[PDB]
Curated annotation (Swiss-Prot), chains A, B, C, D:
This is C-phycocyanin alpha subunit. Heterodimer of an alpha and a beta chain, which further assembles into trimers and the trimers into hexamers. Part of 2 PBS rod complexes, the conventional PBS rod and a photosystem I-specific CpcL-PBS rod. GO terms for biological process: photosynthesis. Light-harvesting photosynthetic bile pigment-protein from the phycobiliprotein complex (phycobilisome, PBS). Phycocyanin is the major phycobiliprotein in the PBS rod. GO terms for cellular component: phycobilisome; plasma membrane-derived thylakoid membrane. It comes from Nostoc sp. (strain PCC 7120 / SAG 25.82 / UTEX 2576). Contains one covalently linked phycocyanobilin chromophore. InterPro entries: Globin-like_sf, Phycobilisome_asu/bsu, Phycobilisome_asu/bsu_sf, Phycocyanin_a.
Swiss-Prot record, chain E:
It holds the Pfam family Phycobilisome. Disulfide bonds: none annotated. Contains one covalently linked phycocyanobilin chromophore. The chromophore is added by phycocyanobilin lyase CpcS 1. Heterohexamer of two alpha chains, one alpha-B chain and three beta chains. The gene is apcA1. The lineage of its organism: Bacteria, Bacillati, Cyanobacteriota, Cyanophyceae, Nostocales. It is a peripheral membrane protein. One of its GO terms (cellular component) is plasma membrane-derived thylakoid membrane. Keywords: Antenna complex, Bile pigment, Chromophore, Electron transport, Membrane, Methylation, Photosynthesis, Phycobilisome, Thylakoid, Transport. GO terms for biological process: photosynthesis. SUPFAM superfamilies: Globin-like (SSF46458). Light-harvesting photosynthetic bile pigment-protein from the phycobiliprotein complex. Allophycocyanin has a maximum absorption at approximately 650 to 653 nanometers. (2R,3E)-phycocyanobilin binds at residue 79. This is Allophycocyanin subunit alpha 1. The keyword Membrane applies.
From Swiss-Prot, chains G, H:
GO terms for cellular component: phycobilisome; plasma membrane-derived thylakoid membrane. Keywords: Antenna complex, Bile pigment, Chromophore, Electron transport, Membrane, Methylation, Photosynthesis, Phycobilisome, Thylakoid, Transport. It is a peripheral membrane protein. It comes from Nostoc sp. (strain PCC 7120 / SAG 25.82 / UTEX 2576). Its main location: membrane. It holds the Pfam family Phycobilisome. The lineage of its organism: Bacteria, Bacillati, Cyanobacteriota, Cyanophyceae, Nostocales. GO terms for biological process: photosynthesis. The modification N4-methylasparagine is found at residue 73. This is C-phycocyanin beta subunit. Gene3D superfamilies: Phycocyanins. The keyword Thylakoid applies.
Curated annotation (Swiss-Prot), chain I:
It comes from Nostoc sp. (strain PCC 7120 / SAG 25.82 / UTEX 2576). One of its GO terms (cellular component) is plasma membrane-derived thylakoid membrane. The gene is cpcG4. It is a peripheral membrane protein. Rod-core linker protein required for attachment of phycocyanin to allophycocyanin in cores of phycobilisomes. It comes from the Bacteria. This is Phycobilisome rod-core linker polypeptide CpcG4. One of its GO terms (biological process) is photosynthesis. Belongs to the phycobilisome linker protein family. It is found in: Cellular thylakoid membrane.
Amino acid sequence: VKTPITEAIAAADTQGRFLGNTELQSARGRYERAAASLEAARGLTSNAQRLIDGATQAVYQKFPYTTQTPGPQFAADSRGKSKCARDVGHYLRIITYSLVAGGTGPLDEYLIAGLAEINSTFDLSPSWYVEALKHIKANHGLSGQAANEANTYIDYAINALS
Amino acid sequence: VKTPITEAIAAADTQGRFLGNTELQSARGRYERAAASLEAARGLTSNAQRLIDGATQAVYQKFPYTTQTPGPQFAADSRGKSKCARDVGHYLRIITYSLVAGGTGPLDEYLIAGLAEINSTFDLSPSWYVEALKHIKANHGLSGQAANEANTYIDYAINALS
Amino acid sequence: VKTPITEAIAAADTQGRFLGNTELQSARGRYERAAASLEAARGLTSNAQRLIDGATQAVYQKFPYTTQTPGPQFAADSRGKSKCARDVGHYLRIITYSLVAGGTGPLDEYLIAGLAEINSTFDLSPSWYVEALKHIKANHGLSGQAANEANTYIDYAINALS
Amino acid sequence: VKTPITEAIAAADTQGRFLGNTELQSARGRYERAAASLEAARGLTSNAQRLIDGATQAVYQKFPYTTQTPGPQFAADSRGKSKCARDVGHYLRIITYSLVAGGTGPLDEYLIAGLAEINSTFDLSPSWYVEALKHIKANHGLSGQAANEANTYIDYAINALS
Amino acid sequence: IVTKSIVNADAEARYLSPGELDRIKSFVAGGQQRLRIAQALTDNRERLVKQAGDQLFQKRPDVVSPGGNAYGQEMTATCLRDLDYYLRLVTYGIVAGDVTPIEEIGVIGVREMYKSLGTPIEAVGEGVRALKNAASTLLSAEDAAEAGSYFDYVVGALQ
Amino acid sequence: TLDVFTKVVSQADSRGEFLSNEQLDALANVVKEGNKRLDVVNRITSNASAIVTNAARALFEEQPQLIAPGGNAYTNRRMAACLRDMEIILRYVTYAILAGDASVLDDRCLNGLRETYQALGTPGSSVAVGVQKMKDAAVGIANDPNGITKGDCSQLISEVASYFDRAAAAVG
Amino acid sequence: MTLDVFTKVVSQADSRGEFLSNEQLDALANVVKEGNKRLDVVNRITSNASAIVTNAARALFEEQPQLIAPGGNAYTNRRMAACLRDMEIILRYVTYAILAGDASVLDDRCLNGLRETYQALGTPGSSVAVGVQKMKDAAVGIANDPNGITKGDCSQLISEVASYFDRAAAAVG
Amino acid sequence: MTLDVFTKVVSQADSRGEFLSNEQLDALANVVKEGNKRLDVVNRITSNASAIVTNAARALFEEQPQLIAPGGNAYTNRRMAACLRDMEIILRYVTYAILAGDASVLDDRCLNGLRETYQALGTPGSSVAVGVQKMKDAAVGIANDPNGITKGDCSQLISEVASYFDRAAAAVG
Amino acid sequence: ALPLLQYKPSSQNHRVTSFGAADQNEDTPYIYRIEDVSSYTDIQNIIWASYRQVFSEHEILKFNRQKTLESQVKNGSISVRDFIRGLAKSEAFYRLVVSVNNNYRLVDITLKRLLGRSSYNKDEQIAWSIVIGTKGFSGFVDALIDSEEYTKNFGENIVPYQRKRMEGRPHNLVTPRYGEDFQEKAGTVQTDWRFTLDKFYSRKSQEKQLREGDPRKFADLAASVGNQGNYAQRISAFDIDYLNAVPNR
Ligand SMILES: *[C@H](C)[C@H]1/C(=C/c2[nH]c(/C=C3N=C(/C=C4\NC(=O)C(CC)=C4C)C(C)=C\3CCC(=O)O)c(CCC(=O)O)c2C)NC(=O)[C@@H]1C
Ligand SMILES: *[C@H](C)[C@H]1/C(=C/c2[nH]c(/C=C3N=C(/C=C4\NC(=O)C(CC)=C4C)C(C)=C\3CCC(=O)O)c(CCC(=O)O)c2C)NC(=O)[C@@H]1C
Ligand SMILES: CCC1=C(C)/C(=C/C2=NC(=C\c3[nH]c(/C=C4\NC(=O)[C@H](C)[C@H]4CC)c(C)c3CCC(=O)O)/C(CCC(=O)O)=C2C)NC1=O
Ligand SMILES: CCC1=C(C)/C(=C/C2=NC(=C\c3[nH]c(/C=C4\NC(=O)[C@H](C)[C@H]4CC)c(C)c3CCC(=O)O)/C(CCC(=O)O)=C2C)NC1=O
Ligand SMILES: CCC1=C(C)/C(=C/C2=NC(=C\c3[nH]c(/C=C4\NC(=O)[C@H](C)[C@H]4CC)c(C)c3CCC(=O)O)/C(CCC(=O)O)=C2C)NC1=O
Ligand SMILES: CCC1=C(C)/C(=C/C2=NC(=C\c3[nH]c(/C=C4\NC(=O)[C@H](C)[C@H]4CC)c(C)c3CCC(=O)O)/C(CCC(=O)O)=C2C)NC1=O
Ligand SMILES: CCC1=C(C)/C(=C/C2=NC(=C\c3[nH]c(/C=C4\NC(=O)[C@H](C)[C@H]4CC)c(C)c3CCC(=O)O)/C(CCC(=O)O)=C2C)NC1=O
Ligand SMILES: CCC1=C(C)/C(=C/C2=NC(=C\c3[nH]c(/C=C4\NC(=O)[C@H](C)[C@H]4CC)c(C)c3CCC(=O)O)/C(CCC(=O)O)=C2C)NC1=O
Ligand SMILES: CCC1=C(C)/C(=C/C2=NC(=C\c3[nH]c(/C=C4\NC(=O)[C@H](C)[C@H]4CC)c(C)c3CCC(=O)O)/C(CCC(=O)O)=C2C)NC1=O
Ligand SMILES: CCC1=C(C)/C(=C/C2=NC(=C\c3[nH]c(/C=C4\NC(=O)[C@H](C)[C@H]4CC)c(C)c3CCC(=O)O)/C(CCC(=O)O)=C2C)NC1=O
């Protein structure tokens, strides 16, 4: 699965050669940034419960019909709202997973793989989840270069949504 | 040709996706490494003429028969010694080329590609060139982390020789 | 493109043989079906203008927020409502096209090919168009076996939507 | 094996999609004619014993040397004439098989597959069997559209013979 | 020939004449042979241009003289490019049947242009005449009459 | 690929006799009962996408660890994997009702499916709890009294459900 | 591409973006009656499909006899069998054209790149269209048959059939 | 072929066969120094990659409105998804060019045979480069804009970021 | 031995995704798969359509068919990817294509038949033409079927076919088994009189028809010589300063 340490391996393995200095250099790059990436993981893990209920009530604001229309898919009764905090709470897990891995791999393999297939069948509009993630990237309270770090992977999930 | 910036491209191009944060990390690594690699290029370029004639007379020491045996291949007369400083002087060029590129690419494409084909036909024993490169890696006078930097690519040419 | 007369050809062409009685039988079936299918084409062409504005105001009922939210995709101002009757009016064209062709070919090539790509980019939820097509299949006023005929292709566009 | 119901399946299976109305239409066509094809099966089954000995003595007329020349390949003695009514009696079986199947499949799989290999080895000239089948298509006594239907498959075996 | 017939019947108040419809029918009937001539001239672009330019420099050495305009490799390359342009316009005119593509792309204001460029007109014209002779030698005989008569329009209109 | 028309040929070829008259009276009922079969298939394929998710509202709600972290339907391509081939059951069951014989069903869903389902690690028995939930919705749609002239489709209803039971037996 | 009479009157009607007019549906209604006659007619071509090809090969080679004589491109035995396979592929796609009712499936297979290979190989291209005309002389002789078919005017249909051979001869010669 | 700023100053230096000069290494030292900015520019483009394409498609089709109207080559739905499946491939390789720092990886994929297919298919070639310019107007607006970032002149990167779009528009038009 | 030179790939149809399965037309080929057996008609169709790609339909014949490899395919002992190697590395295919065509055109004809794509540029045909020469033809056919573009797109058990020819001529039809430069050697354009008429007025015959002498015979030699002369000197004649230009002694 996609990781800068893995991407050095799978490039050098398909050539059948050893680890050159060019694969070695890629590994070194992760460390400079991995020191600031683990700063972004603790910023999201400590503020996790504020961010989930901060998000799942922000999507109810912009889409008020989602709490009103009676459908299995919509979040009309409590069972949808129970599956609301599950789904949005699944996003902050994988975002924090792809932070400490350094690559988009866990985001690529757990979340966005086959997302167009599932949202068409269950009629979950992807405009809902992109509205929650814009709330997360503006309200995580992170600063410095770590604020850039979470901001890529959130925005990477945004582009894969649309 | 093989470069950590190129290796980020050819990995992301065969997948048909954009540049993720994982492709970017390899490029990021090069700048910190590349600051100490260009230190190693000036250390070899300034001491270039001392190192070539330091090497081509060191190989004559360990192999004294190479100046005595009369053959087109051997360096008996002046024409071999003229082609001596050409060949060993070609090595310090490509070593300095692979220093500033950061990868083994120019070393992989100019020097060692098809080297087993050429040394069998012209009967040039590869034990000669590995004896010159051991003289270079011990007598370049480089220090610090830059001394590690030239020491990989010299030793990478050694393993491809044997 | 997909047609029972075409499907007899492309089956017999890839085998490199003539038209057997098996290839021929499919064509024979179309004429009996095609006599009742052209009944369904005149039933939709004559009631075309009632059915479009019957549909594009039925989708505004179940989704009242689509006329209220200001967005390029949303039909808030008159521009969206101008593109409302264009899009829903495009559906009754291709449904009437696939009626007289006998196959799903024109429906497969003009309408549903790459529909998951376009609805993700422009954020057009496919739950909108399936609500208009349920209004069409219940309000075309068609009867008999011709009422079955339009009801397949409408429902075939429904399943390709979700 | 080749059948208009099968040909609808194998076309839709290689695309990986469901049964559209274009595969459905082909099935109906087979069923409708199939009412006149089973008329042709009873016309050949009831007149079966008249048609076999009507045929195997018609081929002896046009080829009188086949009962005279001494060779296993030829029908000189009674053992060839015993294998005469076997072989021509095998033809009316497969013709009646391909009648009720609606396709040329049982004719394609039981009779004509590899017929050029067998007639070259045993030196059975295919001009013999085509002379028997012309006697069958003119003396079955069938009338109407069933007369047309019975003939196609007889004439399809004729073209595969030559 | 359709544009010219339409604008000629446009100047009058009436429709297209039966004579003009016969002209359009005969032009359609000869159009496939004209496409064959265009095929040959397209595929012989290089050697026709080079032979015509070198025939020009054999006839007129004033342009490649050091007082002349086409002195030097770059200037003579632009000379051959001008001959290439005119051969391209000749192929357009052979295909269309009109000379309005030749005219409104390369004839209508060429005298004032080559006056301001310092280039002599007559040497351009002699080069297009060399193109006419070369393409006449390449093609079939009355086919070469067809090609060389459009070349003849270009030659007479340049001077 | 076999049929009702072609399988009564294929055993009749193996015995090498002409087709009997009571086999042709059997096939005459197949042509007579043929129109009903087409109608049943049409309603299944038009409600084909509506069946699969409505089976997926119960295939995952009844065994809820499957979706939950750890189960084999957990991540998103894994979830789209059991909708990619929940419909392939319907893609070949509808081929079986069209052909009228399950010999085209047993080469694709029944042949090597029980081998991959222990090679991958997926629960094989957790498929056939929901293919039964498809059959409960397939014969409900098929038996509808609306928009179709009344006729007896009992043979189709019971041996339509026999194709789902064959589809559940070779997975479980 | 594969087009029809049914699908081509859709495809231009899509390009103008209007509903199908009533006189186009009266045109297609004429076609349904015609189709039954065509199936009976097209079955006669395929049942006499192998009998046409050799009977055309009794004249395709007898009229230009150097072709099978030593030196011609139909001389050796795989070269002779090469021609027969191709000769029937004309009949394989002309019968597809009469079935579809429009020559748009004919022009992708026999008319598209056939005139390019026939100067790349070295075969006489004009010596094909002398015998495809000899196929048409035998094809419309069989289709226009008074035996075993209830008399119905098939002249309107026949004209379409004859032309497909003329399109099959024009793009080779 | 895939080249760089680091590898192209090797490749011409190999063709002349000399050691790398000190002012070439001072040139590359500025490339490493200006290197950090390059990574940032790519990051903002790829994070707003999907937002650029539709916002260019809100003007590529609104300015030439026959293209999606019946008859145009962006009319039907697969066709429409065809000029979003490769509107982004322009962005897929322009971002590869800014990463490598040299347009030699751009000219093998978007500039090599693209002008040949665009007259073989029938698509308007000039109607692409009206909207690739509309991508460049949105790409340098995002890359240039600074939010919560240290401010440094990005003119060298931006002027020659826009040079890659102008090369991407020249070989299509 | 030596790695492949890098060649530029031109933009063609098949480098593109073409999303979806339920959306493509009828005219995409039937993707015959040995895993789908169910009958012998599917078994015979898989063999016959695998001959279709390799021998372009007309040749399959009787003699060309290797009956033992088809004997094996029914058994399932050898994969279809192994089965195309038996047809391609067969001397019934060597006499038909490989001897007859050139190393530069063989790269073009075997990519359309085994990989189902035409070569991008001439540089791709130039690149593999070396791999033919040192490894042999079967060494190169081995390198095509081992290649990762084959296994990703077709796989181990799927007969080849033209990928994504939405608007293109079929590859067995647009390309013969030998081109025009070889046409005199395998074909019979020498003995057919229809072509010698075309040849009679051909520009190449006029170079042959001329007697010994004329410089038009050496006109092809004059284009290959090159070496054009320098122009006259820019410097004006008048300054020359001819009176002081002469050197004494
Ligand atoms: C027949 C009257 C003349 C003739 C035929 C002939 N052709 C070939 C070789 C080829 N024929 C084709 C033709 C087609 N390919 C297509 O895809 C289609 C449409 C579906 C057609 C009609 C092609 C591609 C070839 C090239 C090789 C191939 O078979 O795959 C031969 C063999 C010639 C040779 O092997 O050199 C012959 C004999 N030639 C004649 O002599 C007759 C005048
Ligand atoms: C250029 C068009 C715009 C711009 C850029 C800009 N960047 C910086 C500073 C930094 N940029 C980065 C980026 C990265 N470092 C990494 O390791 C990676 C992963 C490969 C990235 C993406 C960083 C880390 C720095 C400096 C260190 C830090 O931020 O922690 C500056 C100012 C600082 C500098 O010169 O480096 C600027 C100006 N700013 C604009 O306004 C332009 C539009
Ligand atoms: C680990 C990463 C991960 C996530 C996030 C995930 C989400 C996910 N949510 C689903 C359904 C759902 N998702 C929601 C959530 C919502 N719908 C609404 O109305 C609200 C707007 C919104 C929440 C804010 C609801 C209510 C369902 C049930 C819909 C149905 O049953 O049709 C489904 C399909 C059925 C299921 O198994 O429950 C998946 C796969 N799956 C994953 O593997
Ligand atoms: C750009 C990278 C590059 C290198 C380095 C290179 C070397 C190279 N050295 C060669 C020969 C030679 N190489 C040498 C060098 C030596 N022999 C000795 O006796 C000494 C021990 C030793 C020098 C220290 C000599 C003397 C010859 C000539 C031998 C002959 O002619 O047989 C040859 C074969 C003939 C030739 O063209 O001159 C090659 C290809 N070629 C390349 O392209
Ligand atoms: C021939 C078959 C065919 C159809 C049907 C089709 C639809 C289609 N509708 C579109 C946009 C649109 N579609 C709509 C329609 C709607 N949005 C709403 O708010 C309403 C709920 C709904 C109508 C009931 C609107 C308003 C736009 C413009 C949205 C935008 O510009 O972002 C677009 C993207 C931009 C375009 O070219 O105009 C396509 C491709 N394209 C096709 O080729
Ligand atoms: C189910 C379809 C089917 C058919 C029809 C069939 C025919 C068939 N007929 C054969 C021989 C034969 N076929 C004939 C028939 C004839 N020879 C004559 O002289 C007459 C002209 C003509 C009959 C009208 C004879 C006499 C033999 C025996 C020849 C021998 O033993 O050499 C053989 C080879 C030996 C054998 O097993 O008996 C086969 C395979 N096999 C099949 O599987
Ligand atoms: C399609 C219609 C068309 C024509 C005819 C045309 C001519 C043309 N000739 C030019 C120059 C030139 N043209 C010539 C021409 C000649 N040398 C001679 O003595 C001969 C008489 C003549 C060769 C026919 C020369 C020598 C120059 C270079 C003059 C300069 O650079 O100042 C230039 C300026 C440089 C350039 O853009 O190439 C133009 C535009 N352009 C057009 O678009
Ligand atoms: C709810 C239980 C039930 C079913 C299932 C049912 C079906 C049904 N379909 C019928 C007819 C039919 N059904 C079809 C259907 C089709 N033909 C085709 O070729 C198309 C592909 C396909 C539509 C897509 C046709 C063509 C008929 C002809 C008779 C009629 O118009 O009803 C009839 C007429 C009476 C009869 O057959 O005895 C019945 C009974 N009736 C019932 O009571
Ligand atoms: C696909 C399998 C199939 C075939 C082959 C088929 C043919 C077919 N041709 C028919 C009629 C006919 N077919 C012809 C054809 C002709 N008469 C002439 O004298 C002309 C020379 C020739 C046309 C060139 C005619 C005249 C009729 C009269 C009845 C009608 O108009 O359909 C009919 C009417 C119903 C019947 O005969 O029972 C059938 C069945 N039907 C099928 O289901
Ligand atoms: C990596 C380099 C590369 C490119 C660019 C490429 C393009 C490419 N564009 C295609 C089609 C197409 N391309 C378009 C594009 C457009 N329509 C418009 O109105 C716009 C002006 C324009 C896009 C901005 C359309 C509509 C089609 C489908 C045309 C048809 O099917 O008739 C096709 C045929 C179908 C397919 O996508 O496989 C290819 C191969 N292939 C390549 O390998």
